[PDB]
RNA sequence: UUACACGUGCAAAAUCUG
């Protein structure tokens, strides 16, 4: 044929997404005796960068040398991109440094090469050199350096780039705007991200995903879910990257139903084999009270990274299956998956909630010797949690002081919560004091100390701690348990008499306590922390938040149906005993969550073995 | 005049009285 005919065929396949066809035609063209020129090399090199075929890229680079195209800006810039997309920033920089003449694209190719290979600062440094040479940026430049800002978190740098974008007339480019959304979220300004998102003239799925990820990562899970529904309302179809962030919001909200819907979408749309989708699925099921479904997703997973293992390890940890979490960590090492810091936080949390004191000390002490993992403040908080639940409050406080980190509200709150369980009034005062200096607005140290005093019979003291809370304007979030029945969650506080079906819920509670009394249940009043006679103390135990949520569940669901209840507070001992009696009385498996840990009541016992 | 583009999931604690 001709060089034009060969170039047009190669050009078509290189930009269409058929890099091997472009390279096969390159070989046939060379065998044919047709000499490729500067209109062949950029598209053939583009195909190499697409396939990351470094060996062929150097082969074509050799052809460029022999053909005498070393001074061509198009050929050299394609060489920069090829080496950069092949993970060879050194050779990409050597091409860039030796170009006798470059343009914006050659600068963009090198800057994108740095930013795309975990090299965000050398990208910004080259971008700053670009101003000193008076090179006008393009939409590609601003899109690439905004991705570097997002990775580094420099908001003031990105604020300057956003301004430069507007002054350069690129604010309506969908790529540039998508970068601004991701940058602003990753830099801590979710509001500036929403402003760019709202003012956008055109929004792809990347636009909706970057906004939703920014919300779910920032705690606003109700809003990421609302934008997911609004995205479907506008006819935008989520890809395989949208659902992981969406499922992470379902896990935070206990939206077991919602998360089930996404799983059906995942099956229908062929995303079932994606690691991110699988890791988000096991995390969703676990945080929603279904360790069984979480294990099923982990089993069927065709491929697993360290996050998929860490998610299932944290799944067992949160559900009190400490031993099972430790078997998984061993198969991780046998299957050649190195443990991260997130791995050790999860297995240490598993040992804490399951009482594996010996094993918890082993993995913690062996975390840095036998593994490159160095201790974060989260691993020490796990140890304070482990010792606190084992009753070793002296070792817990001594670890807090000797900690190579500055103590926080979590690590002292762990000790304070443990003092509540074991009745250490003195240590409770000390722990509550250190929390108030760290944060004076947290209502937890007040109610905790008020509960500690009231448990000790120090009513006058407890009244003053409650008095001091009301005068400092400290507001506490109501302890409540909710239960999803027919896609409608149902919130219940202790002694709640505001529910529509209150009289049938309470009559059910009366019928239940009748059977519980015959089964041998005797409520103790030492667990009631109110200075009230015995007649109302047993009545107060009867109407706790989860006891209302159970009573509503078994009057609105068929008999024998498993019930799930999510609370924001730890269950007391007598209510843990009462739910054990209820589990066999009603013939159901009742899954109740504390602040984080899950209980499983079945056939008259709980999976925690009365250790939580 | 070719070449250069953006979005990912897994981290320890506490509120039974709002
Ligand atoms: Zn209770
Ligand atoms: Zn239990």
A220: β partners: none
CB A478 within 8 A of CB A545: no
Residue A580 to residue A592: CA distance in whole angstroms: 11
- In the DSSP assignment, the letter for residue A554 is H
- Which positions of chain B lie under 7 Å from any protein Cβ? 1-18
User: Count of CB atoms within 10 A of residue A372's CB?
Assistant: 11
Span CA (A190) to C1' (B5), Å: 23
- Picking from A218, A138, A213, the residue whose alpha carbon sits closest to that of residue A181 is A213
- Report the run of H or E that residue A543 belongs to, with start and end: none
Residue written as tokens 């899954």?
A591
- Picking from A272, A377, A251, A261, the residue whose alpha carbon sits closest to that of residue A318 is A251
What is the arrangement of strands in the sheet containing A590-593, beginning at the earlier edge strand?
A488-493, A480-485, A563-567, A590-593, A598-602, A605-606
> What's the CA angle centered on A279, arms A277 and A282, to 5 degrees?
105
Span CA (A59) to C1' (B3), Å: 18
Q: State the sign of the Cα–Cα–Cα–Cα dihedral A438, A443, A448, A454.
A: positive
- Report the run of H or E that residue A515 belongs to, with start and end: helix A502-519
> Which of the 154-213 residues on chain A come under 7 Å of nucleic strand B at their beta carbon?
173-176, 178-179, 182, 204-206, 209-210, 213
- Picking from A306, A319, A317, A307, the residue whose alpha carbon sits closest to that of residue A281 is A307
Residue A229 to residue A267: CA distance in whole angstroms: 19
Span CA (A104) to C1' (B2), Å: 14
Residue A10 to residue A22: CA distance in whole angstroms: 5
Q: State the sign of the Cα–Cα–Cα–Cα dihedral A492, A493, A498, A503.
A: positive
Q: First CA to last CA across chain A, in angstroms?
A: 79
> What's the CA angle centered on A408, arms A403 and A414, to 5 degrees?
85
A591: β partners: A564, A600
State the DSSP string of A440-485.
SS-SHHHHHHHHHHHHTT-HHHHHHHHHHHHHTT---PPPEEEEEE
Residue A174 to residue A176: CA distance in whole angstroms: 6
Q: What is the dihedral of CA A284, A221, A591, A573, to 10 degrees?
A: 130
Residue A267 to residue A416: CA distance in whole angstroms: 45
Q: State the sign of the Cα–Cα–Cα–Cα dihedral A531, A536, A537, A541.
A: negative
**Ramachandran area for residue A219 (φ above 0: left; ψ -120 to 50: alpha; else beta):** left
Residue A493 to residue A381: CA distance in whole angstroms: 30
Let me know if A113 is exposed, middle or buried by CB neighbors in 10 A (0-12, 13-18, 19+).
buried
Residue written as tokens 């070793």?
A392
> What's the CA angle centered on A414, arms A413 and A418, to 5 degrees?
110
Let me know if A353 is exposed, middle or buried by CB neighbors in 10 A (0-12, 13-18, 19+).
buried
Span CA (A306) to C1' (B7), Å: 22
Residue A272 to residue A27: CA distance in whole angstroms: 38
CB A27 within 8 A of CB A13: no
A599: β partners: A592
- In the DSSP assignment, the letter for residue A595 is S
- Picking from A493, A490, A585, the residue whose alpha carbon sits closest to that of residue A547 is A493
User: Count of CB atoms within 10 A of residue A172's CB?
Assistant: 12
- Domain ranges in chain A are 375-476, 480-606
Ligand 1: centre distance to CA A434 (Å): 28
Extract the tokens encoding A546. Answer: 């989860």
State the DSSP string of A29-40.
HHHTT----TTT
Backbone angles phi and psi of A563, in degrees to 5 = -110, 140
Q: Look at residue A365 and give its three-state secondary structure.
A: helix
Backbone angles phi and psi of A508, in degrees to 5 = -60, -45
Shortest-distance ligand to the CA of residue A547: 1
User: Count of CB atoms within 10 A of residue A596's CB?
Assistant: 12
State the DSSP string of A360-411.
HHHHHHTTTTSSSPPPPHHHHHHHHHHHHHTT-HHHHHHHHHT-SS---HHH
3-state helix, strand, coil in chain A (%, to 5): 65, 5, 30
Residue written as tokens 């009867």?
A542
* Those residues with Cβ within 8 angstroms of residue A490's Cβ, 6 or more apart along the chain or in another chain: A482, A483, A484, A499, A549, A552
For domain A375-476, give the CATH number: 1.25.40.10
User: Count of CB atoms within 10 A of residue A560's CB?
Assistant: 10
In this structure, are strands A590-593 and A563-567 parallel, antiparallel, or unpaired?
Answer: parallel
CA atoms within 13 Å, Cβ hemisphere of A274: 16
> Which of the 309-368 residues on chain A come under 7 Å of nucleic strand B at their beta carbon?
310-311, 314, 340-343, 345-346, 349, 352-353
Query: A216-252: string of b/e by CB count within 10 Å (b at 16+)?
Result: bbbebbebbbebbeebeeeebebebbbbbbbbbbbbb
> Cα A609 from chain centroid?
30
């Amino acid at each position: 044929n001709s060089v034009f005919s060969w170039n047009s065929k190669i050009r078509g396949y290189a930009r269409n997404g058929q890099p091997e066809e472009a390279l096969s035609l390159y070989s046939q063209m060379r065998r044919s005796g047709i000499k490729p020129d500067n209109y062949t090399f950029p598209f053939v090199l583009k195909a190499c960068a697409s396939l990351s075929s470094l060996k062929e890229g150097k082969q074509i680079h050799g052809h460029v040398i022999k053909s005498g195209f070393e001074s061509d800006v198009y050929v050299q810039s394609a060489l920069i991109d090829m080496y950069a997309k092949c993970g060879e920033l050194e050779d990409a920089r050597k091409v860039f440094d030796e170009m006798p003449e470059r343009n914006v694209v050659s600068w963009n190719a090198m800057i994108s090469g740095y930013a795309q290979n975990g090299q965000s600062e050398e990208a910004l440094e080259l971008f700053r050199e670009m101003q000193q040479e008076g090179i006008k940026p393009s939409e590609f430049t601003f899109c690439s350096v905004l991705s570097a800002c997002a990775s580094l978190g420099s908001l003031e740098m990105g604020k300057q780039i956003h301004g430069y974008v507007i002054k350069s007339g690129f604010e309506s480019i969908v790529f540039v705007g998508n970068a601004l959304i991701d940058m602003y979220a990753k830099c801590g300004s979710i509001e500036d991200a929403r402003k760019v998102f709202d003012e956008m003239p055109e929004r792809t799925v990347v636009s909706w995903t970057a906004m939703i990820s920014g919300y779910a990562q920032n705690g606003q899970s109700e809003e990421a879910l609302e934008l997911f529904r609004e995205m479907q309302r506008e006819g935008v179809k989520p890809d395989e990257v949208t659902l992981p962030s969406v499922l992470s919001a379902c896990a935070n909200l206990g939206a077991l139903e919602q998360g089930k819907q996404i799983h059906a979408y995942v099956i229908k749309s062929g995303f079932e084999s994606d690691v991110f989708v699988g890791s988000a699925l096991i995390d969703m099921y676990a945080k929603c009270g279904s360790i069984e479904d979480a294990r099923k997703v982990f089993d069927k997973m065709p491929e697993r990274d360290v996050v998929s293992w860490n998610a299932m390890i944290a799944a067992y940890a949160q559900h009190g299956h400490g031993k099972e979490a430790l078997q998984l960590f061993q198969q991780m090492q046998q299957e050649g998956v190195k443990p991260s810091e997130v791995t050790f936080t999860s297995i240490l949390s598993a040992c804490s909630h399951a009482g594996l004191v010996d094993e918890g000390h082993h993995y913690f002490e062996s975390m840095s010797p036998d593994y490159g993992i160095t201790p974060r403040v989260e691993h020490y908080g796990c140890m304070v949690d482990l010792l606190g639940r084992a009753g070793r409050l002296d070792e817990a406080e001594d670890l807090i002081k000797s900690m190579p980190f500055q103590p926080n509200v979590v690590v002292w709150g762990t000790l304070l919560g443990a003092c509540r369980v074991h009745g250490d009034v003195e240590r409770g005062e000390r722990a509550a004091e250190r929390i108030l200096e760290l944060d004076p607005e947290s209502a937890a140290p007040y109610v905790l100390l008020s509960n500690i005093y009231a448990a000790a019979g120090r009513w006058d003291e407890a009244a003053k701690v409650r008095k001091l809370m009301k005068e400092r304007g400290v507001k506490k979030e109501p302890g409540c348990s909710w239960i999803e029945v027919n896609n409608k969650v149902h919130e219940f506080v202790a002694g709640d008499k505001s529910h529509p079906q209150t009289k049938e819920i309470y009559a059910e509670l009366e019928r239940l306590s009748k059977q519980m009394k015959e089964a041998g249940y005797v409520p103790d009043t030492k667990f009631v922390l109110h200075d009230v006679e015995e007649e109302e103390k047993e009545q107060l135990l009867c109407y706790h938040s989860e006891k209302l949520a159970i009573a509503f569940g078994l009057i609105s669901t068929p008999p024998g149906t498993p019930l799930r209840i999510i609370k924001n507070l730890r269950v007391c001992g007598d209510c843990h005993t009462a739910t054990k009696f209820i589990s066999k009385i009603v013939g159901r498996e009742i899954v109740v969550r504390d602040a984080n840990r899950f209980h499983h009541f079945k056939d008259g016992v709980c999976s925690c073995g009365d250790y939580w």
